[PDB]
Amino acid sequence: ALERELLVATQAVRKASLLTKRIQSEVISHKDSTTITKNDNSPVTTGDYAAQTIIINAIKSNFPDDKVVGEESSSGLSDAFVSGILNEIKANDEVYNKNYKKDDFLFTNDQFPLKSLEDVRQIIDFGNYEGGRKGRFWCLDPIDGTKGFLRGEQFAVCLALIVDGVVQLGCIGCPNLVLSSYGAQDLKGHESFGYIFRAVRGLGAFYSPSSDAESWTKIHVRHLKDTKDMITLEGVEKGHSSHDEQTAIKNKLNISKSLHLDSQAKYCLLALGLADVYLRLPIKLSYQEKIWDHAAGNVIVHEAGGIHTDAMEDVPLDFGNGRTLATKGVIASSGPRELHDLVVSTSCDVIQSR
Numbered sequence: 001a002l003e004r005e006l007l008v009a010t011q012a013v014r015k016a017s018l019l020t021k022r023i024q025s026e027v028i029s030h031k032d033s034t035t036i037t038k039n040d041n042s043p044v045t046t047g048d049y050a051a052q053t054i055i056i057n058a059i060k061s062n063f064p065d066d067k068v069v070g071e072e073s074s075s076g077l078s079d080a081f082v083s084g085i086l087n088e089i090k091a092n093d094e095v096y097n098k099n100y101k102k103d104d105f106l107f108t109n110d111q112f113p114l115k116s117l118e119d120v121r122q123i124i125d126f127g128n129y130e131g132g133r134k135g136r137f138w139c140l141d142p143i144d145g146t147k148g149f150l151r152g153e154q155f156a157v158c159l160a161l162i163v164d165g166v167v168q169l170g171c172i173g174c175p176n177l178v179l180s181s182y183g184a185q186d187l188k189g190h191e192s193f194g195y196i197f198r199a200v201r202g203l204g205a206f207y208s209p210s211s212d213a214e215s216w217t218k219i220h221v222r223h224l225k226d227t228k229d230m231i232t233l234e235g236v237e238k239g240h241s242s243h244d245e246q247t248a249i250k251n252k253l254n255i256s257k258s259l260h261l262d263s264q265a266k267y268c269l270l271a272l273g274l275a276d277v278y279l280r281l282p283i284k285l286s287y288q289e290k291i292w293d294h295a296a297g298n299v300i301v302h303e304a305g306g307i308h309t310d311a312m313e314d315v316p317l318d319f320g321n322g323r324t325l326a327t328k329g330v331i332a333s334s335g336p337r338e339l340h341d342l343v344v345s346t347s348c349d350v351i352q353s354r
C-alpha cells in the first residue's frame with residue numbers, strides 16, 4: 001500500500017527542495033519585493049508559493065480528485081507577484097531537468113499544465129480543504145520555518161497523507177541540513193540540496209540525500225539510559241514556544257545540551273537518532289497548532305520508534321479535528337514510555353505552576 005503516493009510525495013518534495021534551496025539567497029537579498037506580510041504579521045515569500053504550486057500540481061496530475069490542506073492561498077496576489085512565482089518555477093525546471101529528472105514520473109499533464117498565471121492561482125487554491133475525521137487528504141506546509149528560511153538557516157518542505165484522521169505517510173525535505181553541524185556524518189550528494197526523510201505507517205522510516213532519493217537508508221531513534229546525557233530539540237523563535245519553561249524542564253532533568261533550529265527538520269534529527277527530546281510548550285494556551293506543522297513528523301517519528309504527544313495531558317495527537325490540533329503544545333521523544341511520561345508530566349507541572 002501507498003506505493004504510488006510515496007513516489008509522488010517524494011518527487012514533489014524533491015523538486016520543491018531544489019527550488020527553495022536555490023532561492024534562499026535571492027529572497028533574502030530582494031526581501032522588499034519577494035516577501036509579503038499575512039494577517040497575523042507572519043511572512044510569506046515567492047518561495048513558499050512556488051513550492052506549494054509545484055507540490056499541489058504534482059499531486060493533482062497524479063491524483064486528480066484528491067483533497068489538499070495547504071497553508072497558503074493566492075487571494076490578493078498581484079499579476080506581477082504571480083509572474084515571479086511562475087518564473088522561479090520555470091527557472092528551477094531548467095536546472096532540475098538537466099540534472100535530476102526521474103523517468104516515468106509526471107509533475108504536470110494535460111489537465112494541469114502549469115503554464116499561465118491563472119494556472120498558478122488555481123493550483124495554489126486547491127490547498128483550501130479544511131480537513132476532518134473521515135477520508136483521505138494531503139496536508140502541506142510548503143516552507144515550514146519561513147523565518148529560518150529568511151535567516152539563511154534551517155527550514156523544511158513538508159507533505160503528509162492523512163486517512164480517517166490518522167497520518168499514513170510523511171515526507172520532509174530539509175534542503176539546507178548538514179549533519180556534520182550536529183557532529184554527525186553526511187552522505188554522498190547531500191551538498192546540493194540536503195536530505196529527504198520519509199515514512200509510511202507499518203513500513204519504517206528512511207532518508208536519502210535529496211539529489212539521490214533512490215537509495216534509502218533506514219533510520220531509528222536512539223536509546224540513552226540517563227537523561228543527564230540527553231539532547232533537546234527546540235525552536236529558535238522565542239514567540240513560537242515557551243523557552244523559559246523548557247529550560248525549567250531541562251534543569252529538572254539535568255539536561256545540559258540543546259539544539260535550536262527552525263522547522264520539522266527537528267523531527268528528522270530525532271528520528272535519525274541525533275537527539276532525544278523535542279520540546280514545544282505553548283506560551284499562550286489559546287493557540288491551536290496547525291496540522292501541517294506536525295503531520296509529516298508524526299509518522300516519521302512513529303516509524304523510527306519514538307513517541308509523539310501533546311505537552312500537558314500526555315495523549316496522542318489527533319489529526320482528524322480539521323486544520324488544527326485541539327491539544328496544547330507538542331512533545332516528541334525517543335521513548336521509552338517511562339522517559340516520555342517523565343518529560344510530559346514535568347511539562348504539565350511547570351505550566352500548572354504559572
Ligand SMILES: Nc1ncnc2c1ncn2[C@@H]1O[C@H](COP(=O)(O)O)[C@@H](OP(=O)(O)O)[C@H]1O
Binds near residue numbers: 042235263290293
Ligand atoms: N505562537 C505560536 N506558537 C506555536 N507555533 C507558532 C506560533 N506562531 C507561529 N508558529 C508556527 O511555528 C511553526 C514551526 O515553528 P518552529 O520552526 O519554531 O519549530 C512555523 O512554521 P511556518 O514558517 O510555517 O510558520 C509556524 O506556523
Ligand SMILES: [Ca+2]
Binds near residue numbers: 071141142143144145
Ligand atoms: Ca509555512
Ligand SMILES: [Mg+2]
Binds near residue numbers: 143
Ligand atoms: Mg509551519
